[PDB]
Each structure stands twice: as structure tokens, then as C-alpha cells.
Design an enzyme around this catalytic site. Structure first.
Site, PDB file in Angstrom:
ATOM      1  N   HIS A  33     -40.059  49.058 -12.089  1.00 18.44           N
ATOM      2  CA  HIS A  33     -40.180  48.639 -13.444  1.00 18.44           C
ATOM      3  C   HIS A  33     -40.745  49.717 -14.365  1.00 18.44           C
ATOM      4  O   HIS A  33     -40.395  49.734 -15.522  1.00 18.44           O
ATOM      5  CB  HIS A  33     -40.915  47.321 -13.491  1.00 18.44           C
ATOM      6  CG  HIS A  33     -40.079  46.192 -13.038  1.00 18.44           C
ATOM      7  ND1 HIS A  33     -40.201  44.926 -13.543  1.00 18.44           N
ATOM      8  CD2 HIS A  33     -39.106  46.135 -12.099  1.00 18.44           C
ATOM      9  CE1 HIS A  33     -39.314  44.130 -12.933  1.00 18.44           C
ATOM     10  NE2 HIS A  33     -38.639  44.838 -12.071  1.00 18.44           N
ATOM     11  N   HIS A  88     -34.044  46.280  -2.314  1.00 15.54           N
ATOM     12  CA  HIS A  88     -34.018  44.902  -1.779  1.00 15.54           C
ATOM     13  C   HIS A  88     -33.945  44.917  -0.222  1.00 15.54           C
ATOM     14  O   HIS A  88     -33.785  43.886   0.382  1.00 15.54           O
ATOM     15  CB  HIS A  88     -32.917  44.071  -2.433  1.00 15.54           C
ATOM     16  CG  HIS A  88     -33.165  43.858  -3.905  1.00 15.54           C
ATOM     17  ND1 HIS A  88     -32.244  43.288  -4.746  1.00 15.54           N
ATOM     18  CD2 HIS A  88     -34.264  44.148  -4.669  1.00 15.54           C
ATOM     19  CE1 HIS A  88     -32.770  43.280  -5.982  1.00 15.54           C
ATOM     20  NE2 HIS A  88     -34.015  43.767  -5.974  1.00 15.54           N
TER      21      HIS A  88
END
Ligand code: HEM
Ligand code: HEM
Ligand SMILES: [Cl-]
Ligand SMILES: [Cl-]
Ligand code: NA
Ligand code: NA
EC number: 1.11.1.21
Lengths: 713, 713
Positions: free
Chosen positions: A77, A244
Site C-alpha cells: 500500500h 497473495h
């Protein structure tokens, strides 16, 4: 309390140019972050970060006993706000800890992650910035979980207030497309400079475009946003499947349980937000984004299981406990571990955006190659992660510490090492004399050097005169750069260079990069002489010439000035008034309001305008360095009116006679209109100001020439 | 472009503390305006100004051939925004040329007056500020017309951006009272800190309260607003009748003919506004405020004709050509000249607010004495005009130039001259040792010096420790100053002083003002010693003691701190959150956010709190100068909750055990909440920061001690 912004909401805003003053900064004037970091014991920091990974705090218990996934999300992020259009966002200034990014919905519970880092920040103090620590923490997470990173560079100095960035015009968090301030139009065309699909997201909506769970249509958004963050297909697939491989999402209950984001929370929250009323509010009950997906059988260890699952199952649409769309594996066994209960197991799950990696035809070929060749996946993900987290850090000369990778990457816009003696002051005098004797004019010399240096932007530290990329594709063909005139100037300078270098002994030689800039200096000097002033312009040699193979043409395209008020240039017709675009350019160049003012008034009278336009050339002695722009702009004997032909061009006529004296654009006249700018213009337009103007000009000229000179920092 | 202020409209705003940076300032860092002005040829400026009064420009022709009245209006509006409640507004920074003041409706057509001044501004450049030039222009206008002024001081340095001032909450220019953001409540009580009856007015509505033309009720508004600008009845009568001795108002046609104010005007307007479509738009056809009044038979000459008319005729209500209420003498002959047509004459006219001077019983007594004794009127008006135009300039030590009046005025809070040798470094060391040997504690010494110094406000440069007015009425009885504890400290210091002064030869003596400050220095040095650090706090002698007779008690009331977050003090219960009041007080003390942060965290652990409250005293070593406030505030081991008793008080409890560790207020906890303030607190709370904390604390403490020391400028 009503403010000026309330009364006059479309007024130009200059406070963007005065952010980051010494007033707001707690460190002293002389603090040098690079020097502080170079003495940090980075190995000690990294040991403490490894310890932290598995030291679970009860106010935000670690999933699976290990904070690694949370911290990799935190780091992605931090870097993920980056837009190649303007270079704004990214990890380089630690803006995640300030508004609005600290409270974006997509950064929910990252306030927890940052607070877990406080004891480490505190221990090492000014020697490690928050900006660097966020990225380092991400690296250490990867390493703790078995993934070897490509390397790390320190050097991101902290900032002390929010950056002014256009993140969109929507007035509602997460607003779907086609609203009154829609970021989309046409055939899903995202407005520049934005690089996210909804207000308060990093890139895309994990449920699919506007919440519609179509993996194929989601892939279109991922490809467009990631492209707008400088990543191609291979890098995008490696980063999403890499990321992921770790961790989980958090959606244990309805989102209406989650309360105020940090900037809205009560004072007793002490900087944190998204307090949840769902059960214990944390841990097994956590709610972050609303999805409840765990991708792999070993969420705390690097594995090849993401692709095994993606391809190994067929997927069925379902809803999380909060009601979000997500996917579950058809007919699978409960093989995925629970984050807190060792007696529970779960079927494999995916986001819509994870299935994009299999159902978009171009991504599928990449994902398959990575599935079949996991060593190729690991290497691509390491490279991409380093790129992600370093993309806005600037030239390699800024990289600090013992983990900097030696490999030079195309995206870094690399500049070759200098391996020879540099020209000295005597040689610079001789080159300036040859430049002036060649017949090159003040206007040519100043325009060329401006074109080469003014590509710099401070947002991601790309651009500038180092490299002599003005002679290469694509810069040599940009309209603003006046390709045919530029080619004649480069041809003359390259002949000067060849003759000087051919006459040297030892290995002494001048680069074309340095000569372009020294020639601009000579032009300035000659302009001052034309006006009766004796001026030497400072010059620092040491620039080198990059090759075309070191210059990614597609990545260079985002640096093209489509608006450059300093050359009175506007490539087409934009939504944003030209004066607003001028202040935006000033901000990228790192100029204050006075420096923008002096610089533009000098360039006008020196002949820097594109096409030799007369707009704003308020002097009868072009190519002489004087404060004529200011004295004549402020003369109340002249009356201004917009032309019939074009409302953005103005005629200045003698108010008594009606005679035509000047023409100007909105960039020109704003200095006589905006009350703050006009106050600056008046200082430079006063009878005592000619020498101040000249000196201040030379200073800002030299600043601009040196903006990319991190080798001298 | 959605901003933080849009998403979080009630968050605290720190940017008020970082206005006026070196970035926004066009002058170099070493520019000293006082040095420039002292070499101005003031007499030459005044001769150019005299000439200008009668040199009409076609784009704004002079009424009666003479710009005197316009420029007196300009200078009274420059000075007329001043509010005694916070010292904000006034002429001292030349803020009329920035938003919003440049575009207030009551400043209409003053943009023309400032443009008429540009040729002279331009000629003299940096040697005369705009701020000075507005006031000087008004003096010269008065002089040119036969009026002897009281004098003039230069020294108002220019500013380069808008000040942040609360002017009200209304969202409509000139909104009548009783609306949703009404500045009135109760029985016509105007909210503090305001000093005007409607948004965009200087003081009152010339037609009467909310447009009701009742002179008697208009007098009540005059009296209240003028009092809030620090002018009593005699000064208010003298100023209104004085001003309206000159010039005229402008209301030749309907106001809907007037276009956009300067900040809203087109760029071609070049900073001017209120372009009028009524006939020629200017001169005989001018429209400014909508009234059409010319008060006297000789508008370009000082006279006593305002009062001759006011008393000599009976008045009747009528309407101007724009439809505003005003008064005419119908019994009169046509004795008043027309501004442009020598063959036209008019009857005497008055505003409703001029008739207030005759029909309010208290004003009438004054006006009559002025009518009968116009030499007393002239003297009162000269003194009031000087006061008006100098009231925010600060101590007489800032007054520059050859026209400064020698008479010392009570409103100036005067400081007696020092006629004796000052203490030296060895003497200051012996005094510090005697103060520490007396038994006075670090808390007592720090609290006392803080109380004496922290009355300073940069808005009008009133207050500070010079004078030792802490020992006098009213300061010695202010609740914040802890009057019984203060009396015991001053008694001990006065005995030290008497003993040291009695032992000297050669006239050397120390003032109590200097000793209070030096004693605070000793406390800070002792606090550092208590923490194990040897430091010297800088100390500059030369303060003097003012007498009670040189101290206007009523004027001092506005300096009482009713909120002082640096002492965790709130006198009662306000609408504005305590953290907002803290930033307000920081701004008045001229502190940046980092300086406010260091200072408050040091004061907390030194025992500066009023009442010895424990709120915010997050240390187990009170009276030692450490960074404990920040280390303990930022410890995530502690969880905060508002108390049942008081929502503005908070308990800090061990998060694991529930044990009570601390209590704090909103002022304490905002440093742990606000994302920019918490970033600052982190720097001071880090493990490497003890040295930095102490140095930065001593520096800001010394700054505060010296805020009023313009004798050392
Ligand atoms: C299409 C791009 C992406 C989408 C739409 C996306 C979406 C999400 C969402 C919805 C979560 C769950 C948040 C929560 O509820 O806690 C998350 C978690 C996470 N993502 Fe992504 N992601 C993207 C790309 C990335 C990238 C590029 C990386 C890193 C290289 C990353 C690494 C992570 C990690 C490690 C987590 C787990 C957090 C944890 O364990 O607490 N993702 N992702
Ligand atoms: C109750 C206080 C006051 C009221 C309501 C007020 C009202 C006004 C108004 C409505 C005008 C006409 C503006 C226009 O249409 O051009 C004006 C003009 C003027 N006022 Fe005042 N006034 C006040 C106090 C003052 C004071 C204190 C001074 C100076 C000491 C001043 C000096 C002037 C001058 C000289 C003009 C004439 C302008 C010209 O000739 O262009 N007034 N006044
Ligand atoms: Cl940014
Ligand atoms: Cl102000
Ligand atoms: Na950036
Ligand atoms: Na003021």
C-alpha cells in the site's frame, strides 16, 4: 469560520508551493538524513524486525501467529499510490502516515501495522525514516517467510505534512463510476493523472469493476491501473500472485460494525481507527475490507501453492460473512488453515481479481509459465517487488546502505559512471567562448538548456539534464522541444564537443549533457552582458551521456510537457486553466512562488517561448536579461482585453491612444491579477530591483540546472 | 479536487502556524525592512504624494480634482479591521492588498486607490512597504488639505500572504443578523472576537442597524464596534466627524450595475474589481457603497463645517439614487459643491450614523463641545487618527523615522527608558545562584516567568515580560496567574533584587522585569541539572519596570489568558475545542508546530500547570527537564478513555492490568491523536532525542522570553 477557499473556490492555490517549509519540520536546518542512515546499523534493525514478526500484541493479534502478511500489505500500500502520469504518490515520503492516506478505506487496519512498528522507530530515532522503515518491514516479512528479496536501498527522508495530490473529485468514499464527479468517461477511460478505479482504493475493486464479479472485466482494470503505476503484464502477475502467496483478507462480520477511520475517530483512539463492534473486534473476528479469503495452505511461508490452487480447481461464486463477492473452490477438501483455531480448516478461496490471472488470456499465459516454472515466478516477483518499492526514489546515486543491488535496471533511467577527468574552470571558460563564437543565439541556448533540465520532477525524481536524453527518442521529437530547432543546436554543440574532446590529453572529455547545460549558462551570461550587467553563472560538471538502449521510450513518454508555462506552451485544450497548470509544473520543479515568478519573467525576455511567440515578451530588448517583463506588465497605462478570436489570449493597448503594445496569455497575465503573485511581481518591477532580479534569476536558473544532481548531494 | 478539509472539516488546522515562511518571501533571508526604511528620503516621498493628490487619472477621476478623501478612507479601512479581543486586523501588515480584505464590500474602489499609489511604490521600492505607504498616504492627504497630524511612524514590514483570521461564519457577504450563522445573540450581543456588525463591513452599516435608519439605535452599534477596536466615545466622535469633514460617498446609480469584486474578476481586470455598467462607470457616475452624501461645503479642505451642518439644520429621511437610506437638510440652500460640474450645487446630506453623533445623548455632549471648540476637535482627531493607524504597531521601540511623536501615550503600554549600566554575565550567574538558594522551586520559577512572558501576541505586538506588569493590576489578579502563589514569588524576587541593587557601585541595577525572566532561566537550568544535564539558558537584560500609573487597566483586560493550553488552563467552558484554542495561542506567540510541541511537553514536566493539576504530567520526575511527556504519551501499553465525570478529561490505564497511570485533557492527548502533531511528538519521544529535546526546549523558552524585545532588534 468562512475562508478564502469558501468565497473564491476556483482561485489559484499557491500554498502548494510553500509546503515543506523549515517552519513545519522538526529537524534542524542542517539535518541530513542520508548521513544519519549511513551510520544506522541496518543489520540490528533487521534483527528487531524479524523478532517483531512473531511477537503478537493483544490489541491486534497476529494471524497464524505471524504479522508478515499484514506487513507485506502495508508495504505494497505504501508504494501502491504511485502514478507514472505525475510521479506523485509512492512510498518515497512516508505519506501513508498522514491524511488522507492514513484513512483511506483500502488502508484500513494499516494504522495497526504502523503502530506495531513504533517501538522500533523509537529505538533507532532519526537514523531510520518511517518511509524507509515501511519498505524495510515489507522486505523483512518476505525474508522471514522464506522469500529471498532482490535488495533494498535506504534514503527516503521523512516529510512532516500531507502532500497536495489530486486523488479525484468524488465527494463520497469508494463512489462507483458515473457519478457527478466520475473519474471515468467513454469506454471505461480513467482520467489522468489518476491510477485507481475508485476514491480511496490503491488500484482496483477486489470484487470486480464497480462491484460486478467478472474476472475478465476485472483484468482490464488491473492492466490499466498497473500500467499507470509503471508495471507491465509480467510484473503485474508476479506481484499479485506473489503477494497473495501470503496471509489473508478480513471479513468476519458485517461492515456496519466498523467505525470511524483514523482522521474521524475520537481523541482517545490515539491515532488509530476502524474500531469494530463485531465480537472481539480483532483477531479471528477482524474486519478490514469485508472479504474472507485465505489463498494458500501455508499462509506464513513462501510456496508455489497460489498457482496450484488457481489452476487446480474450478471456482464458484459466493459471499463472505460481510456480504462481498468472492470465490470458493468447487468440491475441494478443507485444506487451508485457520488463522487462530488449530482444529478448523477451510476450502481454498480467491478474489475475483485473482481469477483475472487465469481468465484474461494474456495473464493466463504468464500465470501458466509461472506455475510450470516456479523459479521464473520467484525471480520475477523479487524484481517486481524491488521496482514497486523503489520506483519513486530517483537516480541510483540516492540509494543508500549495504543492500543496494548492483544490477542496473532499465526503469531506473540509468546514467553511466564517469571514468575520466572532468573539465575545470579554465576549460568551461574556453567552451563558453566557443559556444558564443559559433553563432548560437541567447534564445537558442537558453531554450535548449531549459528543455533538457525542466523535465525533472521532484515527485519521483525522474528527469533533468543528466543523461543528455534530449538528444534521444522520445525527447528529441517532443513538440515543446521544437524538434527542428533542437536538432540544429545539438548539431552545433556536438561539433564543439568533438573538437574539444579531440584536442585533449589525458582522458579529459566533456559530455554532451554538461555542454548543453554550460551552453545555456553562456546564453544567460551573454543575455546579462546585452543588458549591461557583468554576471558569471555557476556550472558544475559531471553529467554523463546515457544511450538509447538505457532509455525506455514508453516510460519516458509520461515526462513530456504538455503544458509548460515557462515556455508559454500548451499542447492542446485542457479542462484545467493554464495558470493552474503552471503552478502544478512549478511544484514538480520544486520552486517556490517567488522562484516561479522570477524564472518566468526572465525566460520571457530571453526568448524561451516555443515558436518564438511574442505572448508575454514585454520588452523592446529581447535577449537581454532585464526585469522588463515586470515593469511593463504592471504599467497601468496599458489596458488588457481578451481577443475575439481566442478568450485565452489578451491584447494590451495604450489606454490613452488605443495603440497595440503587447499580447499575452493567461500564464502571462496571472502575474498582474492574482493578488499574491502581483505582490511578487511588484518587488521585481520596482526601480531598485534590476540587480536583485538578475541575481535571483541566475540562482533559480542554476537550481533548475542542478535538480537531478544527486551525485553532488 | 477533494481535499483533507473536505473529508474531515472539523480536524485541527496547523497550516496557520506555518504561514509566513522563507519560501513565500521574495526578499532575501537577511533583508531588514527597518534598515531600508531608515535610509528612505521620507520628505521626497511626501512631496510625490502631495503631487499625486491633485493629479487625476482618467480611469478613476478624482472627485473635486483631489484624491484626499479617497485616500483618507483607504487608510482608515486599512487600520479599521483591528479587533482588541485578539489584536488581529489593523494596518500593521498591509493586509488590505490580499484576500479577503481586498474584496470586502466595504473596501470597494479602494483597489483604485492602491493602484494610484503604484508609481510611487515602484519609485521607492523596498525602502517603503505597502503597509507604511497606505498610512503615510492618508497623512499626506490630511496635510495637503490643511490638517495638522500628530505624527507618523514607519516600520510596518510587508507580508506576502493572507493572514488567517476569523472574520465570522456567514456565507453571504453583508448578511443581515439573525441568520443561521448569526454573529449576534441575546440582546444584540456581538460574538467575540468580532468587531463589525455584518460580514465585509469595517464597523457598522451606514444606513443603520440591519438597514434600519434609526440614528439612536445606530449609535449603539457604533459604540460597541468602536469599543472593540479600542476607541472610547471621545475618540469615536472625533474620528467619524473628522473623516467626514472630507470627500463624499458614491451612489450615482443602482448597485446591480457593479460587477465582480477583485478576487472574482476576470484576469484582464489586472487585480481591479467592481467594474460598473452605470454610464461611464467612474467619476460623476461612480458607485461604491450606494449612498450619495457630500458632508461639507469645502470637501477638499479641513473645516468645522461637519458639525456646523449637523447641528445647524433639521434632517429628513430620503433615498440615494441606488435606493439607500440617507438624510437631507430640505430647509437648506444648495451650498455643497458638485464633484465634477462647477455649475451644480447640492443640499447638505448626512448618513444615519452621522446623525448618531447628534441624537445619542452621550455623543451629543461630545459633538457639541467639538462644535463650539473646533481646536479641541482638531486635537482630538489628530490624536485619535495616530492611535487608529498605530494601535497594532507594538512598542515605541519599533517606531521609525523623523516624524515620530515624542509624547508617550498611555495606550502604547509604555516602558520607561533605562538610564543605568546593565548586569553582565557574571552578575546574571550570581543572581541565578541567589534565586536557586532562596528556596523557590523549578515549578514556581518557570510558572512565574511563563505567566509574565506569555501575554505577548504577535498580532498587535502587545504584551510580554517587559514592564513587569505581572506585578500590577490587573495581571497580578488573573486566575491563570495564581495570584497568591504569584505574590509569594514576587516578594522573594523583590528582596533578592533589593539586596543586589544595594550592593552595587556605579549605578548598575537590575529591573524586576529582567529578574523575573532570569529567575525563569535559573529554573529551566536547574530542571536540566535535575535530569543530569548542564545547560546555560541565554538571557538578555534591558527590560524596565512600568508603574501602575503607566498601565491602563481596562485596555490590559483583553490580554488575560482565558485559555492557555501551555498551562493546561481553561477559565470556563467554550464552544471551541481546547486543542483549537491551543493552536490559536501558539499563533499569537508566533510559534511553529514543532516549537508548540516541544514547549508544551517541557512545561508539563516542569510543573507549569495552573493549580498544580496532574493532567498531562506524564513523568515520575517532575521538575526535571526530560522528554518523558512524549515517551509516555506515545506508549501503546497505555489505553485512554474519557471519564464519566468529564468527557474532556481522560484516564490512561495500563492496557494489561487496568491500573490507573495518568490523566490528561484534550490539550494533552491531541499530541497522540492528530497525525501531524503525533509525527512531531514521535521525534521528541525517540531514544536518541534527549539532547535535541533539551536544546529545542531552551531555544523556544528563550524565544518566548524575548518576544517583546524590539529594543534588541
Ligand atoms: C489487483 C491488485 C490487488 C487486489 C485487488 C488486492 C486486494 C487485496 C485485499 C482485498 C486484501 C484484503 C484486505 C483485508 O481485508 O485485510 C489484500 C490482502 C493482501 N494483499 Fe493484495 N491485492 C492486490 C495486489 C497485491 C499486491 C501487488 C501485493 C504485494 C506484492 C499484495 C499483497 C497482499 C497481502 C500480503 C495481503 C494480506 C494481508 C494480511 O495477511 O493481513 N496484494 N489484497
Ligand atoms: C461609523 C463609522 C463610519 C461609517 C459607517 C462610515 C461610512 C462611510 C461610507 C458609507 C462612506 C462612502 C463610501 C463610498 O460610497 O464611497 C464613507 C466615506 C468616507 N469615510 Fe467614512 N464612515 C465611518 C467612519 C469613518 C472614519 C473613522 C473615517 C476616518 C477618520 C472615515 C473617513 C471617510 C472618508 C474620508 C470618506 C470619503 C471617501 C471619498 O471621498 O472617496 N469614515 N464613510
Ligand atoms: Cl505525494
Ligand atoms: Cl491579521
Ligand atoms: Na512520488
Ligand atoms: Na493585528
Amino acid at each position: 469560520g468562512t475562508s478564502n477557499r469558501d468565497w473564491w473556490p476556483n482561485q489559484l492555490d499557491l500554498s502548494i508551493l510553500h509546503r515543506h517549509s523549515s517552519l513545519s519540520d522538526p529537524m534542524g536546518k542542517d539535518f541530513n538524513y542520508a548521513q544519519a542512515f549511513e551510520k544506522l546499523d541496518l543489520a540490528a534493525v533487521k534483527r528487531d524486525l524479524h523478532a517483531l514478526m512473531t511477537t503478537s500484541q493483544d490489541w491486534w493479534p497476529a494471524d497464524f501467529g505471524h504479522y508478515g502478511g499484514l506487513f507485506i500489505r502495508m508495504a505494497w500500500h505504501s508504494a501502491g499510490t504511485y502514478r507514472t502520469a505525475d510521479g506523485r504518490g509512492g512510498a518515497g515520503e512516508g505519506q501513508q502516515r498522514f491524511a488522507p492516506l492514513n484513512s483511506w478505506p483500502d488502508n484500513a487496519n494499516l494504522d495497526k501495522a504502523r503502530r506495531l512498528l513504533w517501538p522500533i522507530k523509537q529505538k533507532y530515532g532519526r537514523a531510520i525514516s518511517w518511509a524507509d522503515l515501511l519498505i524495510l518491514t515489507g522486505n523483512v516479512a518476505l525474508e522471514s517467510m522464506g522469500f529471498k528479496t532482490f535488495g533494498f536501498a535506504g534514503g527516503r527522508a521523512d516529510t512532516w505534512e500531507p502532500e497536495d495530490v489530486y486523488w479525484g473529485s468524488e465527494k463520497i468514499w469508494l463512489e462507483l463510476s458515473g457519478g457527478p464527479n466520475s473519474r471515468y468517461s467513454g469506454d471505461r477511460q480513467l482520467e489522468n493523472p489518476l491510477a485507481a478505479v475508485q476514491m480511496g482504493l490503491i488500484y482496483v475493486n477486489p470484487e470486480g469493476p464497480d462491484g460486478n464479479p467478472d474476472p475478465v472485466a476485472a483484468a482490464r482494470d488491473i492492466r490499466d491501473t498497473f500500467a499507470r503505476m509503471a508495471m507491465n503484464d509480467e510484473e503485474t502477475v508476479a506481484l499479485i500472485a506473489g503477494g497473495h502467496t501470503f496471509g489473508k483478507t478480513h471479513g468476519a462480520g458485517p461492515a456496519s460494525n466498523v467505525g470511524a477511520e483514523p482522521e474521524a475517530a475520537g481523541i482517545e483512539a490515539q491515532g488509530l481507527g476502524w474500531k469494530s463492534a463485531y465480537r472481539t473486534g480483532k483477531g479471528a473476528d477482524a474486519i478490514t475490507g469485508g472479504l474472507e479469503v485465505t489463498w494458500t495452505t501455508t499462509p506464513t511461508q513462501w510456496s508455489h501453492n497460489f498457482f496450484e490452487n488457481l489452476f487446480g480447481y474450478e471456482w464458484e461464486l459466493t459471499k463472505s460473512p460481510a456480504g462481498a463477492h468472492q470465490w470458493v473452490a468447487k468440491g475441494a477438501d478443507a485444506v487451508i488453515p485457520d488463522a487462530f483455531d488449530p482444529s478448523k480448516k477451510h476450502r481454498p478461496t480467491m478474489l475475483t481479481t485473482d481469477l483475472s490471472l487465469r481468465f484474461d488470456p494474456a495473464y493466463e499465459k504468464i500465470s501458466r509459465r509461472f506455475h510450470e516454472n516456479p523459479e521464473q515466478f520467484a525471480d520475477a516477483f523479487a524484481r517486481a517487488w524491488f521496482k514497486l518499492t523503489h520506483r519513486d526514489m530517483g537516480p541510483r546515486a540516492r540509494y543508500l546502505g549495504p543492500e543496494v543491488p548492483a544490477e542496473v535496471l532499465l526503469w531506473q533511467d540509468p546514467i553511466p559512471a564517469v571514468d575520466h577527468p572532468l573539465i575545470d574552470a579554465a576549460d568551461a571558460a574556453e567552451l563558453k567562448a566557443k559556444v558564443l563564437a559559433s553563432g548560437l543565439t541567447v534564445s537558442q541556448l537558453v531554450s535548449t538548456a531549459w528543455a533538457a533540465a525542466s523535465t525533472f520532477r521532484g515527485s519521483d525524481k525522474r528527469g533533468g539534464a543528466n543523461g543528455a536524453r534530449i538528444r534521444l527518442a522520445p525527447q528529441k521529437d517532443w513538440e515543446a522541444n521544437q524538434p527542428e530547432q533542437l536538432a540544429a543546436v545539438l548539431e552545433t554543440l556536438e561539433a564543439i564537443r568533438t573538437a574539444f574532446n579531440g584536442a585533449q590529453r589525458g582522458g579529459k572529455q566533456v559530455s554532451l549533457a554538461d555542454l548543453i547545460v554550460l551552453a545555456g549558462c553562456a546564453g544567460v551570461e551573454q543575455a546579462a552582458k546585452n543588458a549591461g550587467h557583468a554576471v558569471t553563472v555557476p556550472f558544475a560538471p559531471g553529467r554523463a551521456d546515457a544511450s538509447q538502449e538505457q532509455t525506455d521510450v514508453e516510460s519516458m513518454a509520461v515526462l513530456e510537457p504538455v503544458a509548460d508555462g515557462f515556455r508559454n506552451y500548451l499542447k492542446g485544450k485542457y479542462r484545467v486553466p493554464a495558470e493552474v497548470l503552471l503552478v502544478d509544473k512549478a511544484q514538480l520543479l520544486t520552486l517556490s512562488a517567488p522562484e516561479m515568478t522570477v524564472l518566468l519573467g526572465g525566460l520571457r525576455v530571453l526568448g524561451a517561448n516555443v515558436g518564438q511567440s511574442r505572448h508575454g515578451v514585454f520588452t523592446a530588448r529581447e535577449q537581454a536579461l532585464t526585469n522588463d517583463f515586470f515593469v511593463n506588465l504592471l504599467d497601468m497605462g496599458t489596458e488588457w482585453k481578451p481577443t475575439a478570436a481566442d478568450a485565452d489570449v489578451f491584447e494590451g493597448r495604450d489606454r490613452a491612444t488605443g495603440e497595440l503594445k503587447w499580447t499575452g496569455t493567461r500564464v502571462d497575465l496571472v502575474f498582474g491579477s492574482h493578488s499574491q503573485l502581483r505582490a511578487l511581481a511588484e518587488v521585481y518591477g520596482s526601480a531598485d530591483a534590476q540587480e536583485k532580479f538578475v541575481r535571483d534569476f541566475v540562482a533559480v536558473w542554476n537550481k533548475v540546472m542542478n535538480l537531478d544532481r544527486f551525485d553532488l548531494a
